[PDB]
Write a protein that binds this ligand. Structure first.
Ligand SMILES: *Cc1c(COP(=O)(O)O)cnc(C)c1O
Ligand SMILES: *Cc1c(COP(=O)(O)O)cnc(C)c1O
Ligand SMILES: OC[C@@H]1[C@@H](O)[C@H](O)[C@@H](O)c2nnnn21
Ligand SMILES: OC[C@@H]1[C@@H](O)[C@H](O)[C@@H](O)c2nnnn21
Lengths: 831, 831
């Protein structure tokens, strides 16, 4: 066998080679003698896409005949990655396409590397939305993902001289085989304008019009013939006023200025956990909300209502036919917008319209760090969206009256709960708009949802306890096991079968093989094969050598002070310093690989990439160190690079200050792929250690209590400097130019910060972190017992499947039951 | 029979219905129950496009194995119109697709109306280039059309309140089924920068880079299996410097500013016979030249040279493998650019490089009116293209030295011939660069090429007589007979066969039926059927009724003072005035239809559209006139509207002041479609009257001699005003608000101009024009004898085929022999 990537059947390997040669000639208009690997990749992309249009068309007509409650997942980010392999996995096409291209004389693997990632996300948030869409289609949900088809996704990172250089991601330069533009369904979105209060309504008048044109991408569930839809809006100028708001300027200039309306979907904002209050961002937020709500209401007005049902467009059943989920506060304008359409256009009374709005909306909060929070200045909302500010003031008015009635006399509560923040500039607090206008609010890991109830939304929890929930994040076992680690999925499937791919709790059955000797050597063999293949990819695409027999220590995630790549840096420098001190003493060899992108304006995260490259500069060229220690910055980290490094890791760094990483999902990916975790009791590390047992994890540090104790006291970093010689030695190395010789003051900003303004108190966890790291090296030395802990982690990772998450969203927030029932075939059909 | 639009064969009607249902499902991802006519149009467009990719691939590999001399036709305009029907005509698919969609229950005609015109031209020039491409593919020439893929072609004209309103032509909103993007073949184009003169060369340094990405459209010859290529460049920003010319500005802003480089192909300049010296226009001109020349040289470096031939890249054979034709001076920078690449990059000596450049280039001049002429200010060329200005100064230097040697002492000649014009601003005269750097210069009709030799390029003709040629324009019989007038092509084909479609001189054989009674009634019957169908289309898409039993008097062309829609206006007002004077006197009924677009800044042409609508306002609502006279402005005139009005015309207006319309091609279209011509002895009207006999035409007016006599004297329009009461009456009607009641001064600008600054002396031809118009009404009254003159014109129109024009370009300028040999089948094949 190759692996169990499906059957390579006789009629179907021949079917696929026929269609591959059809598309190269008819679609690509190339012949075999001028086709490059890229043309061969497109011939394949088109042949696999033909296998899901049958199922797409019949999944959509099915939701039309039966009319289930529809789930609208609204996100400004969807981080899909590449879609050829994933689509072959979900349709069971992967071995038939492997044989078929083999017979055509091509390497499928070589062609899969040609696909550009769809990079429409920054990281965690965007990828949670792509893992969610996979699980909704796998669980038979009538679900729709909605977002912006950005033409430039997250920048490609280049390192020049150790510094990040950002360059535009032109992911569409060659085309996207997977979208279907739907210009028939373009919709108008209004901006600026003013409100006339006339007789039987307010009206929004003298608005600028932008057209939202849809592009649909298919989302296939795993082996069940459901193919749901991701619809992504693109901005288009009208050809009228963007031209005929006549009377000199210039004709050519009017046409060139069209790219003013079309700039709304041009580029993703490259910030992860940081709010920039730019007008273009708010235009992006209103545009995906306005266009999506029109499409939603349009579908509901057909339903079985636009036939009969009671007969009246009674929006009373709108919540029993519509669930819209808000992915963070970025689509929060869906609350005042659903109100506007219903009061202003459909003419419902306010209070009916408000009951229908809270009953269909639900809000997911993703972080508690204050600079991530949206607080949009009122003059901005006032200019651009004047009806919506009025609706926000009226919602506020009425909500604070409920607070006043329940907490009579508590005047500080009222100022603390207001959706309107007074101050220098007044602002609207979008998270407050979202708790007031949603029937459910949830965090993303059990400790983060407890921190919401206890600290940041405590007033809101005391008011309406029944709204706050938890739904711990997950990861999809299809890309994150079966696709990136087929060998591990194989050796698992040999022992327990293939039903675990859509039932990840079945992995508990591996616990019976924790003492099976053939299993332990197999598990250790695929990890070694992954390490060898990544070690190779590295000299191929990017390198000057590494050693596959070392511990692969990796921390790959966005560069932030709260995720503390700096604490990892302090640990690498220690290791170096100890082996400069005792050169001929044995130490377990490590390749520590750190990678991630910094948002362009985040000066400290840019300085941290520069420190990591400066350490590898020194460490990787010291001869006394030899191959005992290598430090590597993993360039342009993205979804496809994660599918290559996470199978190859031995140790996962999940080192954020307790209370700052709300969940994390990279931690989950590493746990089902055979890495052991070194982490703090933060986010979902706590539920993972509870699932594997704390003995099967390396936890260290401060807990949330201890962080708050320290903050009661006052964190003084000099106390640590003064008491720990190894820590002291490192800072004066940074401070004197040991690591930056030509530019000795270069790192003074990291030193000054760590010493005087460290928000994430890197020094407080340093002692217990280098002690915990001594413990993992000790165990790496006992291969057999490292692999049995690995086994304890894999067999215990099934809780962290996004199928478990989506089934709890479905039941406890959406009111819909998941299915795992194969939809009636693909079978051809024309009606 | 339906007509002879090919066979509707059994295996092939079934082949086409299979493929139509394949594309609607697999390409369009629609099913029969949600498909609109537009989806049905795309299913068809894709099924007919599959039939020419076989022939395209094998026509191109054929020119590769046999390696003929290649003809590069460089134009900034290609006015293609719609391409579904035209492609069905050239592949003999039209009746099989008619039966196939009929069986599917659809009307092909209804779907053909859904296609948007490719409007990448202003009129005459752009359409001559589309008629040329058809004839080169029909004559087996290895020819390539090269231009800019503008994303906005010529604006769509809207009339509000009688005024033209321009709106952006978003022809690509729904997609173009016919192009194939070729992003693999993107090429760099450089701008700005500076020149370093270093040791063994000048170098062009610190340039801004724009990428030219190609899009190929197929050009099928008529029924010969040749499918040539039209390649159209699109501008794309690099993702490097258009981003990493680093150091603050803003990351988002850098990505948004990409549409600064991409504005180069955004919109066609909407000016016909008028030069605007805007920097964006010159960027458009360099960009199609730079990118095209790279592709040209790239193809030549493979040829049989990049194998062996002598062995050295001896550019000596470049003229024997390459012909590049300059369509007007818009690609004139192809001369200094071919020099730059050869001296600066390929390191040929100047004089070898100059001999190779003049021997491969040829220039077509299209007009003598002075404001149409390109004279680019030197500070513009100096900034943007500094190497090329140096090369232009060196070419000038050397050319004037040849003039000095031949005309010793003639110092005025030298200042008159210079490519550099001194004055207020120095300018480069692009037409002079083109005669100096081309081995052939030609005009477009016999009198226009005589006017070039006698007036505008007289000095150049005395210097190098052997360069000046004539190549009278033509029209393609495939769109302009067979496609727009199938009934006329039928009744012709009944009598003489179908070989005339690629041999239009065979139409002379209709002269034997000028007295055949069945033929005369047939010819009269298709004209009546065309008139009925256009009269219908009109109430459908646009109307409030016309009478098909009147003479259809039409003048449809761009609005210009030289084409004199104003003289036609004077004639309509006369007719009205005479029948207000004698109400109960019979006059032959006329529907006079005038249509065309005005360039946006051309205030007088905009005022002329407004006069025409103001006349129809009055005339079409006078009850005394009844249906004896209707005046209609034919909105948004373009290629597809021409295919509908020109079959339906009885009389063609070709009324420009002698010496101003260099050729005209609308005049030709009307002559093979059964309209009689009222015209002056201008452009190609002279060769048409010479071909049908002046008895078979209505010529009037001043000849060129008489225009110059009048200009020797001094044209005084008041002399006409004073002597012709009917003319006098009209001007005081204009002047008093008879035609503009609420705004009595509205037309004072037309009056003031006609009276004091008429360049095209509208009043001098007025008497002989209304007398000639009395003669055509007299003959319309004798139906039998109108149709025998019509017959004398049709049978005599074969000279005016673009197949005759291209065969004289081929033989007398390009050095290649036309073929009419069917290329070896389409037959499948994979190598
Ligand atoms: C999963 C993923 C993330 C999230 O990882 P965390 O460690 O939770 O921050 C970010 N980026 C990429 C490319 C990922 O695949
Ligand atoms: C052929 C054509 C022209 C040229 O007509 P002239 O009468 O020579 O000016 C212009 N516009 C359209 C749409 C045409 O088809
Ligand atoms: O919920 C998905 C991820 C969480 O796992 C991260 O911990 C948190 O920082 C975040 N912010 N936005 N999206 N996310
Ligand atoms: O050659 C094609 C046509 C001629 O027929 C016109 O008479 C002339 O005004 C023109 N200018 N540019 N292109 N053209």
């Amino acid at each position: 066998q190759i692996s169990v990537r499906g059957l390579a059947g006789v009629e179907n390997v021949t079917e696929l080679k026929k269609n591959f040669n059809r598309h190269l000639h008819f679609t690509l208009v190339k012949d075999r003698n001028v086709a490059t690997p890229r043309d061969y990749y497109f011939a394949l992309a088109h042949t696999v896409r033909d296998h899901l249009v049958g199922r797409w068309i019949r999944t959509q007509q099915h939701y039309y005949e039966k009319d289930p409650k529809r789930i609208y997942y609204l996100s400004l980010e969807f981080y899909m990655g590449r879609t050829l392999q994933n689509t072959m996995v979900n349709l069971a096409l992967e071995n038939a396409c492997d044989e078929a291209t083999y017979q055509l004389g091509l390497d499928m693997e070589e062609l899969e590397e040609i696909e550009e990632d769809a990079g429409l996300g920054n990281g965690g948030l965007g990828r949670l939305a792509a893992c969610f869409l996979d699980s909704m289609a796998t669980l038979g949900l009538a679900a729709y993902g909605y977002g912006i088809r950005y033409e430039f996704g997250i920048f490609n990172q280049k390192i020049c001289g150790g510094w990040q250089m950002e360059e535009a991601d032109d992911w569409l330069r060659y085309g996207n085989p997977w979208e279907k533009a739907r210009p028939e369904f373009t919709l108008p979105v209004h901006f600026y304008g003013r409100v006339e209060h006339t007789s039987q309504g307010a009206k929004w008048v003298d608005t600028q019009v932008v057209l939202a044109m849809p592009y649909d991408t298919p989302v296939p569930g795993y082996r069940n013939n459901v193919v749901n839809t991701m619809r992504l809006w693109s901005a288009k100028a009208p050809n009228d006023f963007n031209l005929k708001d006549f009377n000199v300027g210039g004709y050519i200039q009017a046409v060139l200025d069209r790219n003013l309306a079309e700039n709304i979907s041009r580029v993703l904002y490259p910030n992860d956990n940081f709010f920039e209050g730019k007008e273009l961002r708010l235009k992006q937020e209103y545009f995906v909300v306005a266009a999506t709500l029109q499409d939603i209401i349009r579908r509901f007005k057909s339903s079985k209502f636009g036939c009969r049902d009671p007969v009246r467009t009674n929006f009373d059943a709108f919540p029993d036919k519509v669930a819209i989920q808000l992915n963070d506060t970025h689509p929060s304008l869906a609350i005042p917008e659903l109100m506007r359409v219903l009061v202003d256009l459909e003419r419902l009374d306010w209070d009916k319209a408000w009951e229908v709005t809270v009953k269909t909306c639900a809000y997911t909060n993703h972080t508690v760090i204050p600079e991530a929070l949206e607080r949009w200045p009122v003059h901005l909302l006032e200019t651009l969206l004047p009806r919506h500010l009025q609706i926000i003031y009226e919602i506020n008015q009425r909500f604070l009256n409920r607070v006043a009635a329940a907490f009579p006399g508590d005047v500080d509560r009222l100022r603390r709960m207001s959706l309107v923040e007074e101050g220098a500039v007044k602002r609207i607090n979008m998270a407050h708009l979202c708790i007031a206008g949603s029937h459910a609010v949830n965090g993303v890991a059990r400790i983060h949802s407890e921190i919401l109830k206890k600290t940041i939304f405590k007033d809101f929890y005391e008011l309406e306890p029944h709204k706050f929930q938890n739904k711990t994040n997950g990861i999809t076992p299809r890309r994150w096991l079966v696709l990136c680690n087929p060998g591990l999925a194989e050796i698992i499937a040999e022992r327990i079968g293939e039903e675990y791919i859509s039932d990840l709790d079945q992995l508990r059955k591996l616990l019976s093989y924790v003492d099976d000797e053939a299993f332990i050597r197999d598990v250790a063999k695929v990890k070694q094969e992954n390490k060898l293949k990544f070690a190779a990819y590295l000299e191929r695409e990017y390198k000057v050598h590494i050693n596959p027999n070392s511990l692969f220590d990796v921390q790959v995630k966005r560069i932030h002070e709260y995720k503390r790549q700096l604490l990892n840096c302090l640990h690498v420098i220690t290791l170096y310093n100890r082996i400069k001190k005792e050169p001929n003493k044995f130490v377990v060899p490590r390749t520590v690989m750190i990678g991630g992108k910094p948002a362009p304006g985040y000066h400290m995260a840019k300085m941290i990439i520069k420190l990591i490259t400066a350490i590898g500069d020194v460490v990787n060229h010291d001869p006394v160190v030899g191959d005992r220690l290598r430090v590597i910055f993993l360039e342009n980290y993205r979804v496809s690079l994660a599918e290559k490094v996470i199978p190859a890791a031995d140790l996962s760094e999940q080192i954020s200050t307790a209370g700052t990483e709300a969940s994390g999902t990279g931690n989950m990916k590493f746990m089902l792929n055979g890495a052991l975790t070194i982490g703090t009791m933060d986010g979902a590390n706590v539920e993972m250690a509870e699932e594997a047992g704390e003995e099967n994890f390396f936890i260290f540090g401060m807990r949330v209590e201890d962080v708050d104790r320290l903050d009661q006291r006052g964190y003084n970093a000099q106390e640590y400097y003064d008491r720990i010689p190894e820590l002291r030695q490192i800072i004066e190395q940074l401070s004197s130019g040991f690591f930056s010789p030509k530019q000795p003051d270069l790192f003074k900003d990291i030193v000054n910060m760590l010493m005087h303004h460290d928000r994430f108190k890197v020094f407080a966890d340093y002692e217990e972190y280098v002690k915990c790291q001594e413990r993992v090296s000790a165990l790496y030395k006992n291969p057999r017992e490292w692999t049995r802990m690995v086994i304890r982690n894999i067999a215990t990772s099934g809780k962290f499947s996004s199928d478990r998450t989506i089934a709890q969203y479905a039941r406890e927030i959406w009111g819909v039951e998941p299915s795992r029932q194969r939809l009636p075939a693909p079978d051809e059909k024309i009606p």
